[PDB]
């Protein structure tokens, strides 16, 4: 029951890898302590392998099965449709990994005959063959972090032709089933403000609120063949075309359950018997499996009035405190139950009685004040990683622009507004690229977004309050200030000055550019403006922006 097996061949890169933070003429204006930023490479792949390789044990009891039966009952009310080849193709990221069969993402998106014919042939093979394991590629991810160094994460994905077939058979499923099965507990259905709203309204729902987060040690490796088959049983509960049932069955047996691992050089690196992190069902499956195990675990632990919030492998639980002593005991029972379900904790879960002290999805609730001085809750997080990546993206263009995604997701925060917005808008203006669409990711899906639309986008996801928040909490203030000292980032005084400069230059531009200056940097001037709803803000089609998670799902969308 080992998560993985290895032949000994090394996980190889498909291009030159940089470890040290690239430096340019802009670097210092943001960060001085360059040696604290690094990017993980294949060189550490070996360390990760040893961490994610272990034997799994599972003891499923009646609570587990009772929760599963309930989940299947909700799942049966779901009706999913097969996606056409064209539809699935249009969902393919312009820069997705090219197929090993003579065509790439560009060919897929343009519906080239070669790409369509191969896709159709792969689809046919899935319907006729439900046994032969599908090949996958294992790569060491290149991610940027701040020191104090972690080994590179691994990514396992099948060929482009297969990814397109996954979409056809399961896109509609993984996009709609989770919300029906888990209801208000499915986190990807909420925007940042909606997630904060759900957490506060839930916290208040309890007379004696108590909450905690649960971090499973390498969740993907804890997923057993049973878990993957259980997820399939849930999918099959949906009303599906017979052709889709066969495709989902086949993908489960040949890909999801496990298969061979091939490095970028074509050598067999080993075999996988756990969750593949680079497939379409990675997010939905982890969310379903985490919710199933945690729900059953809550019962075993006898937690009162439990309200859960699940996002992939990230879990949040808010319930009725039965006392400080009893809570601690319950939590331990919960952990023991989770462990029996093959989901041991990486870090011991601790009970919190202060919402702001609960961190889930690397984030936490905090409070500030809007123009009217009213108390307003918002989602924030430790700026360290976001700032380390912003430095890298300062001297190196990357496939994913983390700074953009961070600005969109945490626009109300002190650090995103003061630093991220000021810094990158200054750069955009200098290169006159304000209107250039850039790629960023929201909940694992890729989106092409033009900086000039940030104002309208932020107003839609956070409301005008994001443009005028102030008097942040002492806790948040200290955490940001510490980060800035650690990384060597200029003080507010400096950023405010740079913001006025950027703001003035934007206003001169006019059009949307001026809108960016007026709204994004109204906090910089001494005499703030009124700031009213943006007209074109209703034209934006953010329908599929916050519906589900697609981490590793190879999903694309054009705004
Ligand atoms: C990171 C270290 C730090 C210094 C001061 C604070 C706390 C601040 S600044 C602020 N408001 C200003 C602001 C500065 C930068 C921003 F990005 C937003 C708001 C502001 N001026 N005019 N309107 N609002 N409110 C607080 O509690 O944190």
Task: Among 3.30.300.30, 3.40.50.10490, 3.40.50.180, 3.30.70.270, name the CATH number for the domain at 183-223+281-361.
Answer: 3.30.70.270
Residue 366 CA, ligand 1 centroid: distance in Å: 15
Q: Using DSSP, state whether 279 is helix, strand or coil.
A: coil
Q: Are 356 and 337 in contact (CB under 8 A)?
A: no
Cα→Cα distances 500→417, 484, 518, Å:
13, 21, 10
d(CA 153, CA 156): 10
Q: Which atom of ligand 1 is nearest to the CA of 416?
A: 17
E-assigned strand segments in 348-465:
363-369, 375-381, 438-442, 445-449
According to DSSP, the β-strands at 363-369 and 375-381 are antiparallel
Query: Was 313 annotated as part of a binding site?
Result: yes
Q: CA 187: distance to chain centroid? A: 11
d(CA 360, CA 310): 9
Query: Was 314 annotated as part of a binding site?
Result: yes
Residue 488 CA, ligand 1 centroid: distance in Å: 18
User: Is residue 266 left, alpha or beta, with left meaning phi > 0 and alpha meaning psi from -120 to 50?
Assistant: left
Q: How many helices (H) and strands (E) does the chain have?
A: 21, 16
Helix (H) or strand (E) holding 316: strand 314-320
According to DSSP, the β-strands at 136-140 and 259-262 are parallel
Nearest CA residue ID for atom 16, ligand 1: 418
d(CA 306, CA 322): 12
In the structure encoding, which two tokens stand for residue 467, read together? 């443009």
Contacts of 512 (CB under 8 A, 6+ apart): 452, 453, 455
CA atoms within 13 A on the CB side of 410: 27
Candidates 307, 339, 342; CA nearest to 321 is 307
According to DSSP, the β-strands at 445-449 and 556-558 are parallel
Q: For 453, phi and psi rounded to 5 degrees?
A: -90, -5
Residue 209 CA, ligand 1 centroid: distance in Å: 31
Nearest CA residue ID for atom 2, ligand 1: 481
Q: How many CB atoms lie within 10 A of CB 289?
A: 28
Q: For 377, phi and psi rounded to 5 degrees?
A: -85, 150
Query: Was 62 annotated as part of a binding site?
Result: no
d(CA 96, CA 174): 20
Q: CA 550: distance to chain centroid? A: 8
d(CA 160, CA 92): 9
Nearest CA residue ID for atom 28, ligand 1: 477
Residue 81 CA, ligand 1 centroid: distance in Å: 49
Q: After what residue numbers is the chain broken, C–N > 2.5 angstroms?
A: 148
Q: For 265, phi and psi rounded to 5 degrees?
A: -95, 0
Q: For 145, phi and psi rounded to 5 degrees?
A: -140, 175
d(CA 185, CA 298): 14
Name the DSSP letter for residue 465: G
Candidates 57, 321, 52; CA nearest to 210 is 321
Candidates 396, 397, 393; CA nearest to 407 is 393
The domain ranges of the chain are 1-55+133-158+258-273, 56-132+159-182+224-257+274-280, 183-223+281-361, 362-559
Q: How many CB atoms lie within 10 A of CB 275?
A: 28
Residue 479 CA, ligand 1 centroid: distance in Å: 13
Mutate to test the pocket of ligand 1, among 414, 469, 496, 520 (most ligand atoms within 8 A of CB): 414
Name the DSSP letter for residue 184: G
Residue with tokens 């019962």: 299
Q: For 435, phi and psi rounded to 5 degrees?
A: -85, 5
Q: What is the resolution of this structure in A?
A: 2.2
């Amino acid at each position: 029951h080992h998560s993985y097996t290895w032949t000994g061949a090394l996980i190889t890169p498909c291009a030159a890898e940089e470890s040290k933070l690239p430096i340019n003429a802009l670097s210092n204006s943001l960060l001085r302590h360059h040696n604290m930023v690094y990017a993980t490479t294949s060189r550490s792949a070996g360390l990760r392998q040893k961490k994610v390789t272990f034997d799994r044990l599972q003891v499923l009891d009646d609570h587990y099965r009772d929760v599963l039966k309930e989940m299947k009952a909700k799942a049966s009310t779901v009706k999913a449709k097969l996606l056409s080849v064209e539809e699935a193709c249009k969902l393919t990221p312009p820069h997705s990994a090219k197929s090993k069969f003579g065509y790439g993402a560009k060919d897929v998106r343009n519906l080239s005959s070669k790409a369509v014919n191969h896709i159709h042939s792969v689809w046919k093979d899935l319907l006729e063959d439900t046994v032969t394991p599908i090949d996958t590629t294992i790569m060491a991810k290149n991610e940027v972090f701040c020191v104090q160094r972690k080994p590179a994460r691994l990514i396992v994905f099948p060929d482009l032709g297969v990814r397109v077939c996954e979409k056809m058979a399961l896109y509609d499923v993984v996009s709609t089933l989770p919300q029906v099965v888990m209801g208000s507990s499915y986190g990807f259905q909420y925007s940042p403000g909606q997630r904060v709203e759900f957490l506060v309204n839930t916290w208040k729902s309890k007379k004696n609120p108590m909450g905690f987060s649960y971090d499973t040690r390498c969740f993907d490796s804890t997923v057993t063949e049973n878990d993957i088959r259980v997820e399939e049983s849930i999918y099959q509960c949906c009303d599906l075309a017979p052709e889709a049932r066969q495709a989902i069955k086949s993908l489960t047996e040949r890909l999801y359950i496990g298969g061979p691992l091939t490095n970028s050089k074509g050598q067999n690196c080993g075999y996988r018997r756990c969750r593949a992190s680079g497939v379409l069902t990675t997010s939905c499956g982890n969310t379903l499996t985490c919710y199933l195990k945690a729900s059953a675990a809550c019962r075993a632990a006898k937690l009162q009035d439990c309200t859960m919030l699940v996002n992939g492998d990230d879990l949040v639980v808010i319930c009725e405190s039965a006392g400080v002593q009893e809570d601690a005991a319950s939590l331990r029972a919960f952990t023991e139950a989770m462990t029996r379900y093959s989901a041991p904790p990486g870090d011991p879960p601790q009970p919190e009685y202060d919402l702001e002290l609960i961190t889930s999805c690397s984030s936490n609730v905090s409070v500030a004040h809007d123009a009217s001085g009213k108390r307003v809750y918002y989602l924030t997080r430790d700026p360290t990683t976001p700032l380390a990546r912003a430095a890298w993206e300062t001297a190196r263009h990357t496939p994913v622009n983390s700074w953009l995604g961070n600005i969109i997701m945490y626009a109300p925060t002190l650090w995103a507004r003061m630093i991220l917005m000021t810094h990158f808008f200054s750069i955009l203006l200098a290169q006159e690229q304000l209107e250039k669409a850039l790629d960023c990711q929201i909940y694992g899906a890729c989106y092409s977004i033009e900086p000039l639309d940030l104002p309208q986008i932020i107003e839609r996801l956070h409301g005008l309050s994001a443009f005028s928040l102030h008097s942040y909490s002492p806790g948040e203030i200290n955490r940001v200030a510490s980060c800035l000292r650690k990384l060597g980032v200029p003080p507010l005084r400096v950023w405010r000055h740079r913001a006025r400069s950027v703001r003035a230059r934007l206003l001169s531009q006019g059009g949307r550019a001026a809108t960016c200056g007026k709204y994004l940097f109204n906090w910089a001037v001494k005499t703030k403006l009124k700031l009213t709803p943006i007209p074109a803000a209703s034209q934006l089609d953010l329908s599929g922006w916050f519906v589900a998670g697609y981490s590793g799902g190879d999903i694309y969308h054009s705004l």
